[PDB]
Amino acid sequence: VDAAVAKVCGSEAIKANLRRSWGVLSADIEATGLMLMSNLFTLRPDTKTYFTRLGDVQKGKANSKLRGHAITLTYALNNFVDSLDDPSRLKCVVEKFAVNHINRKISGDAFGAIVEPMKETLKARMGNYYSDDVAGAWAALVGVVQAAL
């Protein structure tokens, strides 16, 4: 966890890429959350096994349980971005976040299923501001969660 936190917090390039991309996503957090979940289930349908409670995830916004989850997910991302200046905060916020994910038996490898879906979401929402380095920044941040699981 400490090494993963240091990789993110010690890099001005990673932090700048996370802040600019989050700024863009924050124009519509509900649409962002729904788009991320859609990309997760389309690219990584294997992950649907973890989301039985949500019912028919193909329904998108019209599924109120999926909608509540998609919106709520973005507030964890908001907290992570607001933690980037402070390694001690990013550490304790990620370890807090990890508790329920550990309880649901989501391994670091399983959680990593989010990475390519996040890359596609970034491509579809950032226009020409998208870069490989932006995707890399998000993979590093997801790496902090993976280390905690």
Considering beta carbons, is residue 10 or 68 the nearer one to ligand HEM? 68
**Nearest residue by C-beta to ligand HEM?**
100
Q: Which of residues 49-78 bind other proteins (CB under 8 A)?
A: 53, 64-65, 67-69, 71-72, 75-76, 78
Which residues, including other chains, have CB under 8 Å from residue 103's CB and lie 6 or more apart? none
Considering beta carbons, is residue 101 or 109 the nearer one to other proteins? 101
Residue 130 is a binding residue for ligand HEM (CB under 6 A): no
Considering beta carbons, is residue 87 or 112 the nearer one to other proteins? 87
Q: Which of residues 2-21 bind ligand HEM (CB under 6 A)?
A: none
